[PDB]
Amino acid sequence: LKKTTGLVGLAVCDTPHERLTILYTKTLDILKHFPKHAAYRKYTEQITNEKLDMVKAEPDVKKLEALLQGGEVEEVILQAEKELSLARKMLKWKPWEPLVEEPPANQWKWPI
């Protein structure tokens, strides 16, 4: 177990494995409401399943933190919560749609 996470205001999580299993599974469920053709779904499911396997694969907190490569497992849990938050927002935003509007002819031409 850890005395501290080393980040001011990031509290030690006593049961990281269970906590991460929850977040990834919660994330995989919300992903099922996207269109099957949406890239955000296809890509975010690879990432989650990649990181879900490692949790089920390594029982040791210290050895897990090296596999996930995301810092202290408290940061990884935090980042998982950020990811699940974004999947909710992406669903309403619906960014997979075609381009909303093209720019004028020379909007991005440089130098003029």
Would you tell me which residues interact with other proteins (CB under 8 A)?
Answer: 3-4, 6-10, 39-40, 42-44, 46-47, 51, 69-71, 78-80, 82-83, 85-86, 89-90, 93-104, 106-108, 110-112
Minimum CB separation of residue 81 from other proteins in Å reads 9
Minimum CB separation of residue 63 from other proteins in Å reads 14
- Distances in Å between the Cα of 11 and the Cα atoms of 21, 26, 33 are 19, 22, 32
Say if CB 95 and CB 40 are below 8 A apart.
yes
> Where do we find the tokens 């001011």?
8
Helix and strand numbers (H, E) in the chain are 4, 0
Written as one letter, the residue type at 53 is D
Minimum CB separation of residue 87 from other proteins in Å reads 9
